[PDB]
Each structure stands twice: as C-alpha cells, then as structure tokens.
C-alpha cells in the first residue's frame, strides 16, 4: 500500500481531525467575536505587548488564500513576516512558539542551517557516480511555515533564493 503524504493539508504528521466534541468546541469558539483577542494571550506566553505581532503569527498560521489563476501563475496569497529586535530576548521568546509549538517550522539560522544548501544544489556523488539534487529543507517542505532565525548571517548566494 502507498498512502502518501497528506495531500490536501500539510504533511502526514499533523492529523488534526475533529470529533463531535472537538467540532462543538471549535464552533462554540469561532462564533464568538472576542476570541480573536484571546489568541494574543495564546501567543504571548513569556513576552507581553506587541499583540499585533501575535495577530500576524496566527494569520500566517491560517495559511492565506493563495489562489491558482487559470492559464497563469497561482497568485501568492500566503505571507512571510520579518522580525527584528533585541537578538538576545526578542528573537528567543517570539521564536520559541513557532519553533517548538506551532507546526512544520524548520529552524533556519541562515548560513549555518542552510546545511548543504537552503535552495538546492546539483550533487554528483561517488556512491552511485551520478548527479541528483539537494533540495533545501524549506523547498523540501510543503505548505509549512519555515522559521529563519539569524537572517543577517546569510551567505551571499543565498540572498537571491528569497
């Protein structure tokens, strides 16, 4: 049997189907106008303030409305948000949600976590004596939200992949 990667949603790991209790909890939540604000407390475990940033996080977690235009490019409906602040405290705290908690967030330091290559690289190996591709983790990722900390530590050739 071949049950491949979960096609419609993100990869196989999430499995966030719902039960009647879960559907009822989600409905009881969503129909309430106020919940959008408590999400800020849901994304402010250690730092406080900048709840607008919490809104941004939950939005970019939603996914967007990236639409496939006929006979043309699928328009980008997803969003990528840059953050900059105290490299000591701002980065660690705001990161530690998307890193540890949310989902499918490959930690990316820039130069280092590029590994072999963030984008790709043609590699002709002695093992089979043949050339394949090295797809970076982000491009290996499908539908996720990749976190790139320490962005200013990019190698020069990286600056174009973005």
């Amino acid at each position: 049997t071949v049950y491949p990667l979960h096609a419609r949603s993100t990869g196989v790991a999430a499995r966030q189907m719902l039960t009647d209790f879960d559907i009822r909890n989600i409905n009881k939540l969503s129909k309430k106008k106020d919940i959008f604000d408590i999400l800020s407390q849901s994304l402010a475990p250690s730092i406080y303030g900048h709840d607008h940033i919490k809104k941004a996080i939950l939005l970019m977690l939603m996914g967007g409305v990236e639409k496939n235009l006929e006979n043309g490019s699928h328009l980008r409906g997803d969003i990528n948000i840059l953050m900059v602040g105290d490299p000591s405290t701002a980065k660690s705290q705001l990161l530690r949600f998307v890193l540890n908690t949310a989902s499918l967030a490959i930690a990316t330091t820039g130069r280092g976590s590029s590994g072999v290559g963030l984008t790709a690289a043609v590699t002709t190996d002695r093992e089979t004596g043949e050339r394949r591709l090295e797809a970076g983790a982000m491009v290996l990722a499908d539908r996720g939200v990749v976190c790139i900390d320490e962005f200013d530590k990019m190698t020069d050739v990286d600056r174009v992949a973005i």
């Binding site: 409305v65 639409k67 235009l69 006929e70 006979n71 328009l75």
Partner: protein, 191 residues
C-alpha cells in the same frame, strides 16, 4: 519609474481584486488566448521568414538619421542614452520584420515600421513630464508674417510697394483687408 498616482492605485488595485472575484482579467471586450494554442499560432508565425519591403527603406534610413542626430545633441543632456548605434537601426529593422511576421505577410508595411518607431520612441521620454505643447494653431496674421519671412529669406527688403506680397496672400486665400491691417500693425511694429 512608478510615479505614485491615484487613478493607477485605483484601477490596478480594483482590477486585481476583481481578478480575485473573477479569475479573468479580460473584461467585457477581450479575447484571451490560452497559452497552448497561443504558442501554436506563435510558432506557426515563426515558421514564415518574411521579406523586407523596398519602399520603406528610405523612411527607415531617414528615421535612423534622425535617431542619430538628436542623440549627439542629447549626449550630455537629460536623456543620456548616448549615441544611438547602427545596432539600433538593425534592431528597428528586426522589430519591423517581426511585426510583419505578426501580419503573416512577406512585405513589411510602412505602418509596420512606423509602429516599430513608436515602440522605440515610447521607450524614451517616459522619464519625466511626459507632456508637450502647441502654439501655432491660431495664425490669422502670424501666418502672413511667416510668408513674409520666407520672402525676406529670398531677398530681405522692407519695401514700400507690395505686389508679390499681395499676390502670394491672395494665393494663400487670406483677404486683403486683414492683410492691410497686418501691414499697418507691422509698419507700426517697425519692420
């Protein structure tokens, strides 16, 4: 250079959002072609190899000359595209040939190469102002004056007996009362 205007950010944005509404930018009057059969027709055109028409040459040539001379008096000037080259001429010819391909015709049209010139010049002056003016519309007596000026280029006399002047005015159609009025004005204007 994206001049930040208002009607652009209105229409462009509206129509992008309309794309989100209706996934076809084509409005009521439009014939969008799917890229597949578009490609088909395009390649078919590419398999034609039209011929350069003999008449347009002079015009083409003259165009080049113009596109040359101005360039010199525009070298250090604002639009610093320096010294348009024979490659520009050749590119114009190639553009005309491709438009004739779009005609699927083996003879390039004067309108064809004129459109090519329009393309090459619209690339220019798209930097700033993008406007011009006109003054010579009225000419109810200034036209008489310019005719007189050509006559002066011939000889250059401020005579007191006008017989070829009145003849050329009558040929021009302008009446003799307006002519005499203008003569009054310019004699008073001391010419």
């Amino acid at each position: 250079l994206d001049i930040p205007s208002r009607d652009d950010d209105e229409k462009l944005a509206e129509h992008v959002t309309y794309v989100h509404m209706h996934n076809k930018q084509p409005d009521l009057d439009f014939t969008p072609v799917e890229p597949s059969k578009m490609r088909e027709y395009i390649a078919y055109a590419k398999t034609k190899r039209p011929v350069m028409s003999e008449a347009v040459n002079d015009y083409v040539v003259q165009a080049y000359i113009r596109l040359r001379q101005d360039s010199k008096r525009e070298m250090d000037s604002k639009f610093s595209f320096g010294q348009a080259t024979p490659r520009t001429l050749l590119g114009i010819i190639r553009l005309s040939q491709a438009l004739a391909k779009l005609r699927l015709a083996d003879m390039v049209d004067i309108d064809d190469v004129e459109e090519a010139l329009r393309l090459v010049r619209v690339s220019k002056e798209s930097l700033y102002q993008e406007t011009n003016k006109s003054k010579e519309d009225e000419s109810p007596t200034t036209k008489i004056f310019t005719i007189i000026k050509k006559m002066l280029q011939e000889t250059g006399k401020n005579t007191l007996s006008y017989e070829n002047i009145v003849k050329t005015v009558r040929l021009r159609g302008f009446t003799m009362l307006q002519l005499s009025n203008c003569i009054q004005e310019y004699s008073y204007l001391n010419v």
